[PDB]
Every structure is written in C-alpha cells, then in structure tokens.
Write a protein that binds this ligand. Structure first.
Ligand SMILES: [Ca+2]
Ligand SMILES: [Ca+2]
Ligand SMILES: [Ca+2]
Ligand SMILES: [Zn+2]
Ligand SMILES: [Zn+2]
Lengths: 301, 301
C-alpha cells in the first residue's frame, strides 16, 4: 500500500487506551503527515500573562489514534520517522518540585523562546541548533488506560532523543490495529530532561507505518542510521537499565548463536547504557549497540 | 616545574587512604609516565588453567600514590591524560551474579583476548577498535580508607569512558599533597560496563598534574575536547544522576548570574545525563555540557 493522509491535531487523545476509537484507518506501508499540539496544547504562547495556570488536564495531547490494518496483538508496528518540522517558537518550563533541581526553586516558570534560522535563542548569548525529536509516541497497551505522560511497554512519554528524523521505532502491538498516537515534539532536549521540559513546540511529523509479523518485542526499540537501542521504563533508572539490557540480551539469545557469556562481555564493551529522561513518574533508559554488530550477528528487524 | 618522572607498577595501593605513604613527590606542572597492572594484578595471563580463583584482595591495584607539592585540602588537582598505552593482551570477565545479566549465567567466565593492529580481537568474527581509558583514578579521601573498587567524591573506580587521552580530570583535594593513584586500564568498555568488566589490560599512562587554587569542587569533573561533565557515585543511578546535576548547577550558580530556572531549563535542553557504570559497589553517572556553553559564561577551571 502506498497512500498518504494528513491527520490534523484536532484528532487527539490524552491517555493511551484500547478504548479510544481510531481517528483514521490506514494500511501497512501508508504514510501520514501528523500535526501535533505542543505538550501544553498551545496554551502558553502569549509569553506574557501566559502563566502555567493552564487547564493541566490538557497536557500531552497525542494526535491519533491511528488504526493500522493487519496489526494484531503480538505483531510489531514499525514507524519510520521521515520528517519533523517544528514551529517558529517554543516554551521552556520548570519550577518548585519539577525535575532534578525542583528542590532549589519556588513557584512555576515558563519562558517562550524564538526559534530562528534553525537555532533556539535561549538568551542573548546562546543560539542552540535544533535537534527535533518526538517525546510521546506509542500504541495502546493491552489493558486499562495510561495517561500520555506515563511511558510503558507500549511507548508513550519516553522523551528519548534518538526518536528523531531518520529513526525507526518498533513497538510491540497489544491490540488490533495497534492504535498509534504521537505528540510532545521538542525542538531541542538533552538526555535526562532534568529541568522537566525540552523546548516544547507544535509541529508536523511525516512518518510511515508498517506491520511486522515475525517478531516478538517486550518493549520499544529505536533504530537510527548508526545504533539500535532497546528502551525501557521503570520506577528507578536502575531497574529501567536492567530491563533494557535484558531485552537486548534476549534479542541476542533468539536471533544469534552467541553464548550468554559472549553476550554479556560483548555488551560490556560495545554497548552503552544511556538515559532518556529522569523526571516523569516512571524513568526511561535505553541500551544501545552499533548497527554493524547486530548485522554481523544476523539480527534484522 | 617541568620535570618528567616514570613511576613503576611496583608502587601501588589497594585502597585510597590518607595513610598510604607517597611513592614519589612531584610539583605542579610535572609529568609522569605511570605503569599499571590490570584490575587483576595481572593474575590471568592465559586461559585454560588461569580462571577466577586468584588472590582477590589483589584486585584493582592502583599505581601511586603521587604526592603533589602545593596541593592543599580544598584545592583542586587537575590531571591531564596525554597518552594511554595498553598491553597486547587483555581479559574479559563475567559470570553468575556479575553485572546486569548476572542472573542469567552459572559459574565464572574469563576470556583472554589478543589486542593487535589497534583492535580487540573479541573472536574470530569480530575485531573492535581500541578506545583506551582509565577505570580507577583518584586522590585520598578526607578520612576513612576506601577500597580501590569503590568510587566516591575522591574518584576511585568510576569506570568512566570519558577518561582517555585528550581529557582532563579535576579532583577535589581532601589531604595535603592530594595523593593521586591510577590503574584499571581498559582497552575498550561501553558505558554502564554491564557484563561487569572492560577489556582489562595493563599499560602505561602519560599524565601531567596541576594544583588549582580558588576552585571549590565536591566531586570530580572530566573535561574532554568537546564536553565537560560532573561525575558522581551513589547506591543508585537515580541518586548518582541527581548529585551530578546538582554539582553542575552549583558550578553555574557560583560562576554565573544565571537564575536557577535559567540553569534548570538550560540543563534540560543542552545537558546530557549519562551513565558510567552500573555494576560496581556504587553506580557512577555523569552530567555533561558542551564546552562552548561553559565557555560563553566564562566558566574555566
Ligand atoms: Ca514528555
Ligand atoms: Ca573498574
Ligand atoms: Ca551567581
Ligand atoms: Zn515535552
Ligand atoms: Zn576494569
């Protein structure tokens, strides 16, 4: 299938749920240009008396859900991120009790910054080149309902910098049609997101979807032109690292002839545990390996 | 001063302690070529019979300590890593209960590998370009002895991939003459070190020492050609990351007029919380910023 649709940000959700009716159905191989609201549903723009006294129930709108025909529970949905465009301004936020330095601050803070000629004008001294990424993306979990802001095995709020143009994200599918949704673009974000926010922007994501049938995943996987990382989320970084490393060990166990000791020592010396974010109600980490090692071992998604 | 000394591996310690007598006294500006034995005092030189049933209290011998004239409690010692040479063989170790995948393995594993042509020969199919780094490097703590295998504010077994040629590590000074010692070189290791070990090798480090006055650090900092990262260790990765971020936030607070929220939001978008190791008695993490950001705010240790 080769169709292309545009889905506007008027179709959106707040919690990833098997019960959300689909905004649109497409087929494996189809493309979508998905428009998004920023993390705040665009409530903060007037920069001025735009205080974070927003609605708050309107945070993390994810555009979707998209129903992908052929996707069944146990399959994988592969999402190719081809293009991220971002708006010409963004919003930074932080404050008492928010992120790692929440203990040093009182009150709430927001600043709207300009993005101009591909740079975030943080202040008069730093113009910081954009690295657009998608903070919230995932499929419906098999059961119940999780706020767009809590990451899990189905993706969701992973705030992972590798999900950027050129990346492919693989989710395990828990329900018929997968139900993909995405929002919370950042013009720029550092690993850990230790202030609580990135440069929060509205924008548009050209992506493509494919259904994979032969492949069992327990958690999301992102693959860029150079590395492949398993992503996991848990109540502590330590446990989230453990889960991501084990998920990658399992892919080796299932797709290669390498002994466990082989696995553990290879990972020790060529894999990198890294951090995506530390400031959501679960923390998110990842274990990354270079593509050519996987390829050598015959691991192909 | 511009003397150059060579310090051989027969001068070494097993714990960082203010009580260990100096192997040698040097002055600020002097260089040393420092020989190390591996993490195993060289007790595994071959396979077959050479397995983990070594002397074990002879693990992580650090060469040193070096008394650096002029260094006083409260100063900072800067150690420029100029060259690292590694031996032509190294050892990989893992096994039951070791590192993140300990729960998958039975007994104890080691493999001795050839290092040749600039590559770890991991096995018949895979050769991996070397990236030498120093795993254990530190000064004496203020008070109680700390075994070589544990990291802390004095440094020690931080297993940080950034500590390589071209880097500078800055340590807070706890005792007169600082008492620097180093060892546990790795021909290659990935962040997290999740199998338990690096490519463990002996070798030789060309370094230079300088005493810095009027800089307050609470924990070490590494500066490479590209980034400057605070390093910290704790019983969880979550705390370690929190300490690293705070120590960086305090450098900014005390050396700039950026507000706390300026700091927090800047860190959120341009700083990277990163992992050094999760398998030692404490985990070590880091927080890294691009050098030109510190440079703009006139931050130079
Ligand atoms: Ca987010
Ligand atoms: Ca070590
Ligand atoms: Ca200040
Ligand atoms: Zn966001
Ligand atoms: Zn080591």
């Amino acid at each position: 299938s080769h169709m292309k649709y545009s889905l506007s940000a008027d179709h959106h959700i707040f919690a990833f749920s098997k019960e959300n009716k689909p905004a649109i159905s497409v087929k494996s191989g189809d493309e979508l240009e998905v428009e998004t609201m920023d993390c705040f549903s665009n409530q903060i723009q007037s920069n001025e008396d735009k205080l974070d006294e927003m609605d708050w129930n309107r945070v993390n709108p994810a555009t979707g859900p998209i129903f992908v025909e052929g996707a069944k529970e146990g399959d994988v949905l592969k999402v190719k991120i081809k293009k991220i465009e971002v708006a010409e301004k963004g919003v930074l936020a932080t404050g008492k009790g928010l992120g790692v330095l929440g203990n040093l601050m009182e009150g709430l803070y927001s600043k709207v910054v300009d993005i101009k000629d591909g740079k975030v004008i943080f202040n008069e001294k730093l113009a910081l080149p954009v690295k657009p990424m998608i903070g919230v993306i995932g499929v419906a979990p098999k059961e119940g309902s999780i706020n767009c802001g809590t990451p899990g095995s189905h993706g969701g709020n992973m705030d992972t910098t590798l999900i950027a143009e050129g990346a492919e994200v693989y989710f395990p599918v828990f329900v018929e049609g997968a139900l993909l949704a995405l929002g919370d673009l950042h013009a720029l974000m550092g690993d850990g997101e230790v202030g609580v926010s990135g440069v929060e922007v509205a924008g548009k994501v050209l992506l493509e979807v494919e259904v994979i049938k032969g492949l069992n995943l327990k958690n999301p996987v992102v693959k860029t032109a150079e590395v492949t990382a398993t992503i996991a989320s848990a109540e502590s970084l330590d446990k989230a690292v453990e889960i991501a490393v084990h998920d990658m060990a399992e892919l080796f166990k299932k797709h290669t002839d390498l002994s466990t000791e082989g696995i553990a020592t290879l990972f020790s010396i060529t894999g990198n545990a890294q951090i995506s974010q530390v400031v959501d109600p679960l923390k998110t980490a990842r274990f990354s390996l270079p593509n050519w090692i996987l390829e050598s071992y015959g691991i192909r998604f």
